[PDB]
Amino acid sequence: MIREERLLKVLRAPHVSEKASTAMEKSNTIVLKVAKDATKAEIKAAVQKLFEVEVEVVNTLVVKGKVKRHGQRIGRRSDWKKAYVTLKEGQNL
Amino acid sequence: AAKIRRDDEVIVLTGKDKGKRGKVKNVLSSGKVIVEGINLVKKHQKPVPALNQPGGIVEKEAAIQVSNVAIFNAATGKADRVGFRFEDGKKVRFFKSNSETI
Amino acid sequence: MKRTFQPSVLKRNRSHGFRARMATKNGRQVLARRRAKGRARLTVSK
Amino acid sequence: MKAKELREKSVEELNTELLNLLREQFNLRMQAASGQLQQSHLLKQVRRDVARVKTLLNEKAGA
Amino acid sequence: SRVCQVTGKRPVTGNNRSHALNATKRRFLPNLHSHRFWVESEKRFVTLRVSAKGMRVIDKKGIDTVLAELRARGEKY
RNA sequence: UAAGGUGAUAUGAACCGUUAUAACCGGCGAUUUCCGAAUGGGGAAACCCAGUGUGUUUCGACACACUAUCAUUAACUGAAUCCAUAGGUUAAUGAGGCGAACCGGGGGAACUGAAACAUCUAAGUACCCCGAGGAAAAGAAAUCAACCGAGAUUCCCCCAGUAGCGGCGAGCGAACGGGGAGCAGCCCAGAGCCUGAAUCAGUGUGUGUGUUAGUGGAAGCGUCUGGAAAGGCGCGCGAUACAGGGUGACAGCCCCGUACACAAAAAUGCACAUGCUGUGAGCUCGAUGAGUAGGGCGGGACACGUGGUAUCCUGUCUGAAUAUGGGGGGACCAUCCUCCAAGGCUAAAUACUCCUGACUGACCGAUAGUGAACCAGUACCGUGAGGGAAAGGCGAAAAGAAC
RNA sequence: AGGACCGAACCGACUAAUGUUGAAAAAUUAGCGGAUGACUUGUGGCUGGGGGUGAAAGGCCAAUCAAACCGGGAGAUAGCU
RNA sequence: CGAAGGUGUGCUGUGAGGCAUGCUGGAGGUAUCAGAAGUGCGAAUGCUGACAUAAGUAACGAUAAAGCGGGUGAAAAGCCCGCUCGCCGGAAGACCAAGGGUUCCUGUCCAACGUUAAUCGGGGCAGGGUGAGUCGACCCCUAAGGCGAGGCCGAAAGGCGUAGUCGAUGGGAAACAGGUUAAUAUUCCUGUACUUGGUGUUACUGCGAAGGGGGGACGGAGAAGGCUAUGUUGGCCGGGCG
RNA sequence: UACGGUGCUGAAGCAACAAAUGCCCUGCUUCCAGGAAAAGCCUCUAAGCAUCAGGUAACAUCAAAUCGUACCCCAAACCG
């Protein structure tokens, strides 16, 4: 079965929107922010449904949060998941 | 439960100019009320984005306490106290020693 | 030279971990006393 | 009393939930991280609406 | 556990007194030996760890009454 | 309940609302990731890997529910073995783990004192374990008493540092009896009659009283100094309210409140006209609890250290009478008195405070009072159990210093 | 074949010098001893305090050892300062 | 119209002390007589905080040394670039493991950090960066050992242990060259591959397990022989004519 | 040419010799001190079923999830 549309909320932020992300759109792929527990097939079905595109592969890396904070009140940024969704052909985006 | 409403003609009893009267601009949760023309402060404002972009000394209203201000009676030109006197949901305000609804 | 603390996290979690303390009754008293003291870490593992 | 959701007590709540979640939270999140001004209040509105629809679905499953 | 299983006798602490009346702790232990007891009604041998006093209780009362007391206690044969 | 709100530092953007419907408070629900008794299995806590079923399938898979162990009960099976039993499997019901103290029990020191120390003491204390409850334990006379009597247990005041016990040293230290606080007694070993019979539980919409939201609530002006009156001076008013806290300095009349009166959808606690259900009232007698009372040996407890040592408990070895009976009355014997052992239940007066609300302090005031007034069991140290800080104040208002 | 020889890595620690408020709470520099064995080393595991372990020194058991460390009895006691 | 505190001056009592005032201070203090004390400090190798001293003295951390030009900047011995110099080179090179956890890269800043200055840094502050069917873990298995239903044993806690279940430091399937970013590569791309399952189709057919068997599956020293990584040299090719 | 770093094109690209402590080799020899286990893998049956399940080969198609992946790397990122 196809994962339900409720589980198709795995896509969170449309782009990391950085220079390597734009270079990957020039090449073929689109860089996305996906929740933490999203499987590669979940990103695949999610992108093929929410966007119009056909995906060749998804590559996932979990980004680790930096401390980014002074010593009096130590904090940690939340870790997240980055999905390189490869669209070699049949890409409108 | 508020003697001083959001918009009410009030006259100061203590501090700065007591005789000054004006509409309350806002009522804040701290117990502090900003009333027009009653607390003017010369604020030295550095150039800051969005609001007050040119900068400059500005005349803005600080907030006196709500206890300092009392409502200005329409019938008589004196500060008069205000009581809530109705048994159901509408706590109607009434002038003390005058018994007129506010 | 060689020092007393040569770290190994496997030995650390087996020696002073939560499951290691939760197995023994007395280690549960260690955890209970740490909870009573109010510590953020009752176990070195986290 | 502050608000009554008599609209939610009617039927067909699941397609309304799919509309509120699918493409609504999806476009508001995508638009928000792209950078949209009004969407700050709208994001909270659609999240609370999703909570309301799911509460009514737990109360009654006919819709 | 050194429990008589019929009388419930168990080790009891005490002081091993001396001529100088020095109290050093000692333990008085029960006279338990495992014995095979023949139940004529059940047609089967029941094995119980028992003190000599418990064997005397069994010969005084019958193995069935003691067995009913054991099942009432929850003690297993 | 409300004219303001979107918790704080923390302002701003984007909005929400007019006592008729925003926020906020109360009650009741829903959701409630993962870890943790953790409970499908595993594990290096917050992770890895399954099975079974029901659906759906996009055939790639996706959801949801269940699946720990033990005790009890019931069923269906089922070995050596012949009948069976052990065993297996399933269903249901419970339990588990945590928590500051109090309580009961299982075990149990030493420093110390004795101006050493071994008997003794510290002390059945510290500690470990087990168990239960809102209290627990105890508890209805084989009890004291002394020829008079009292009448279950617990707690307080004396009795009283008394009698005693004691290397008669250090020390330990009752009881009788009196004053109170509280105070109901029962039940089973056993048949018949009566048969919710009096009770006691469970379960109850009706009734009152509380709690968890709240509401109303008096009466002050003129002037002076001052930055600002709350201070002064004058003249008033309130007061069942002059408890307190704020307000630009010290306010009974400025504001929260205060006395005082009122309120509760809903959820609950107590007393219940109390309905219903079940256990079981009272009447005649036959007995009223056997490896038990007792004894010998070794210990423990009684204030009592085995002493002249009663009494209670049992590790070991024995062992009655049985209401013609037996126990106690401090070695023991007779008499007299008093009570029925070897089966249980039971409120009150009592102990304590994790926690909550209100009020008080010849309590502290930032080297104090909690370790912590403060984003503290934090930083920091240590492999670990563990140890463990320093750190409050501008101003009335940021009017926090445009140029 | 060698608990053979000479000798790097490796393991150890014989003399000297410097350091001794050091670069270091036992190091550095010159020389030294073993280095196919009773060797050395990594990764886990086991043994717990009147206990362990010891080719034996009262060595070692987290820079702590004729009895580790942590909390409790505990404000032990102190005819002594 | 100036309370406590702090600081002077005068007066005053045998003293401990007191009274008045100037200055500062910006909300309190308490005649008199009673009552209770955390009721008086200069010492305890006293405890805590502040501040001196030695003293602007030792030191600035391997004796692998740097010089100059140019740039930048308010400032250059230390930053960047360039040219010479020296050092290591069975490492002071490069890669894994453990351990750490953003220290990686880019811009900006020089208050604290860096034993000096710092424009620089692993410092501050933002923004980026970690791409896998083939590599590890996960997983299948087991060793030492751990836990262990039932069980046995122990005063309670608990000890031991069968079935079982864990446990790598070992045994199990598979990808290499070249290119790429400021930072990622057996992961992205390009080229050429390999492995294990599922489903379907076709053909053929006896398949089938905590069972049996085989295999996995193993020591030390030593002696070749063959070969490769790798090096040298020649040829070739491109440039040189010092 | 911001001299970081990019865009295009590109000759020769062979032979001999010397080669490891690496490979063949878990081989060979020799010696006593006689040198893991289980799974993967192959094979044979049992219960069980019978144009079945199942196996074996081909062909096609789909899946190969999740975590780590920067950096230090005998050290200014480990322990001191």
UniProtKB/Swiss-Prot annotation, chain C:
Keywords: Ribonucleoprotein, Ribosomal protein. One of its GO terms (cellular component) is ribosome. Coiled coil: none annotated. One of its GO terms (molecular function) is structural constituent of ribosome. GO terms for biological process: translation. InterPro entries: Ribosomal_bL34 (IPR000271), Ribosomal_bL34_CS (IPR020939). Disulfide bonds: none annotated. PANTHER family: LARGE RIBOSOMAL SUBUNIT PROTEIN BL34M, MITOCHONDRIAL RIBOSOMAL PROTEIN 34 FAMILY MEMBER. Belongs to the bacterial ribosomal protein bL34 family. This is Large ribosomal subunit protein bL34. The gene is rpmH.
